[PDB]
Design an enzyme around this catalytic site. Structure first.
Site, PDB file in Angstrom:
ATOM      1  N   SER A  63     -12.379  -8.401 -37.559  1.00  0.00           N
ATOM      2  CA  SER A  63     -10.939  -8.400 -37.749  1.00  0.00           C
ATOM      3  C   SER A  63     -10.402  -6.979 -37.669  1.00  0.00           C
ATOM      4  O   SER A  63     -11.080  -6.002 -38.007  1.00  0.00           O
ATOM      5  CB  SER A  63     -10.597  -9.045 -39.102  1.00  0.00           C
ATOM      6  OG  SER A  63      -9.222  -8.932 -39.436  1.00  0.00           O
ATOM      7  N   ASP A  70     -20.620 -27.159 -40.661  1.00  0.00           N
ATOM      8  CA  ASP A  70     -20.872 -25.849 -41.256  1.00  0.00           C
ATOM      9  C   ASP A  70     -21.165 -24.838 -40.149  1.00  0.00           C
ATOM     10  O   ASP A  70     -22.304 -24.764 -39.673  1.00  0.00           O
ATOM     11  CB  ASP A  70     -22.050 -25.945 -42.225  1.00  0.00           C
ATOM     12  CG  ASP A  70     -22.399 -24.623 -42.864  1.00  0.00           C
ATOM     13  OD1 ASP A  70     -21.540 -23.719 -42.828  1.00  0.00           O
ATOM     14  OD2 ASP A  70     -23.525 -24.492 -43.400  1.00  0.00           O
TER      15      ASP A  70
HETATM   16  O1  LIG Z   1     -24.503 -21.325 -44.646  1.00  0.00           O
HETATM   17  C1  LIG Z   1     -23.499 -21.537 -45.391  1.00  0.00           C
HETATM   18  C2  LIG Z   1     -22.109 -21.900 -44.798  1.00  0.00           C
HETATM   19  N1  LIG Z   1     -21.701 -23.176 -45.400  1.00  0.00           N
HETATM   20  C3  LIG Z   1     -21.780 -23.107 -46.894  1.00  0.00           C
HETATM   21  C4  LIG Z   1     -22.714 -24.241 -47.387  1.00  0.00           C
HETATM   22  C5  LIG Z   1     -22.643 -24.374 -48.917  1.00  0.00           C
HETATM   23  C6  LIG Z   1     -22.970 -23.031 -49.597  1.00  0.00           C
HETATM   24  C7  LIG Z   1     -22.183 -21.837 -49.001  1.00  0.00           C
HETATM   25  C8  LIG Z   1     -22.245 -21.735 -47.425  1.00  0.00           C
HETATM   26  N2  LIG Z   1     -23.582 -21.416 -46.839  1.00  0.00           N
END
Ligand SMILES: O=C1CN[C@H]2CCCC[C@H]2N1
Ligand SMILES: O=C1CN[C@H]2CCCC[C@H]2N1
Length: 330
Positions: free
Chosen positions: A199, A35
């Protein structure tokens, strides 16, 4: 050193990707959601409330000869989708694709919210945003990448996500066989702790490119592409019958449609998302209304280049002293 690990979609829609991670001695392999939008490495564990575990693989620190309680440390995180988790902390040896970090903070969940319990394919998260976002208290902890950085051949990791197929996370090197053309690098702001960049614009289908600055984050942990409401309306206006549904929670479109591509700018370069990448399938089983992969960021406070956008490119997360992002077509 380097590491290289395959990342695999959890379902037929690419709702998320899981990557195997070895924790402890002997190794305990858990499948984690890498993530780049958060900075905590947390896992389902032997400490997780039993009624909140439903099919996940758990980390058991008492079975690891290298695990050590990080005394007094706790953690608690809430994500943009309303999900959350919390617990205590161990240090242990963590390896990803052959790259090993000793003394990594492994955040053991005592509590997870319902959406985590209900997803048996995700054993935890491995955060790859900047360590300034890590939630461990009272002593903030470093991400796996931050801990590995000095040992890596080059202070980088790359995301090469597949469309309806596995892909790769590499650490410490750029695989020049994995992309076409050249990589275009663009500036990053770390002020919010994210891989935040700007972007240079967008196009819908075969339409003309609109030059406009769009600030957002490169977030492998977000499924969809979230952009300003103006941009998203311009996209869905090209799909007969598409509309924003308050009951469903976003743009939906007739499942009979052929979707146009969406292009975003990276400096003077262009990344093209094929229309099929924007189809997230029936809103419910058997429905002829399909959920769109491009959605408005209006209620979020930030634009998010999630998996829909990132999987169209080979993406370099350059963690040099001045971080940058790189995008190539593939
Ligand atoms: O920090 C974050 C990035 N990765 C995802 C995890 C699940 C919920 C949405 C998002 N939040
Ligand atoms: O609980 C928290 C702590 N601050 C941030 C960390 C990364 C994910 C978003 C947000 N949620």
């Amino acid at each position: 050193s380097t590491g290289s690990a395959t990342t695999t979609p959890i379902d037929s829609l690419d709702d998320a990707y899981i990557t195997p991670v070895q924790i402890g001695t002997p190794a305990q392999t858990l499948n984690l959601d890498f993530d780049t939008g958060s900075s905590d490495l947390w896992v389902f564990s032997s400490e997780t409330t039993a009624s909140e575990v439903d099919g996940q693989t758990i980390y058991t620190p008492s079975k690891s000869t290298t695990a050590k309680l990080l005394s007094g440390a706790t953690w608690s995180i809430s994500y943009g989708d309303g999900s959350s988790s919390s617990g205590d902390v161990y240090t242990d040896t963590v390896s990803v694709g052959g790259l090993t970090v000793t003394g990594q903070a492994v955040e053991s969940a005592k509590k997870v919210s319902s959406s985590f319990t209900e997803d048996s394919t995700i054993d935890g998260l491995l955060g790859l945003a900047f360590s300034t976002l890590n939630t461990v208290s009272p002593t903030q902890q470093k991400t796996f990448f931050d801990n590995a950085k000095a040992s890596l051949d080059s202070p980088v990791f790359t995301a090469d996500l597949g469309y309806h197929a596995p892909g790769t996370y590499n650490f410490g090197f750029i695989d020049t066989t994995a992309y076409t053309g050249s990589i275009t690098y663009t500036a990053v702001s770390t002020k919010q702790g994210f891989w935040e960049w700007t972007s240079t614009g967008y196009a819908v289908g075969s339409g003309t490119f609109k030059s406009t600055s769009i600030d957002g984050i490169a977030d492998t942990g977000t499924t969809l592409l979230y952009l300003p409401a103006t941009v998203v309306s311009a996209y869905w206006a090209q799909v007969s019958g598409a509309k924003s549904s308050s009951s469903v929670g976003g743009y939906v479109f007739p499942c009979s449609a052929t979707l146009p591509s969406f292009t975003f700018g990276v400096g003077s370069a262009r990344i093209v998302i094929p229309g099929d990448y924007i189809d997230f399938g029936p809103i419910s089983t058997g429905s002829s209304s399909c959920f769109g992969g491009i959605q408005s960021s209006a209620g979020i406070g930030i634009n998010i280049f999630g998996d829909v956008a990132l999987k169209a490119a080979f993406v370099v997360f350059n963690g040099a002293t001045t971080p940058t992002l790189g995008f190539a077509s593939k």
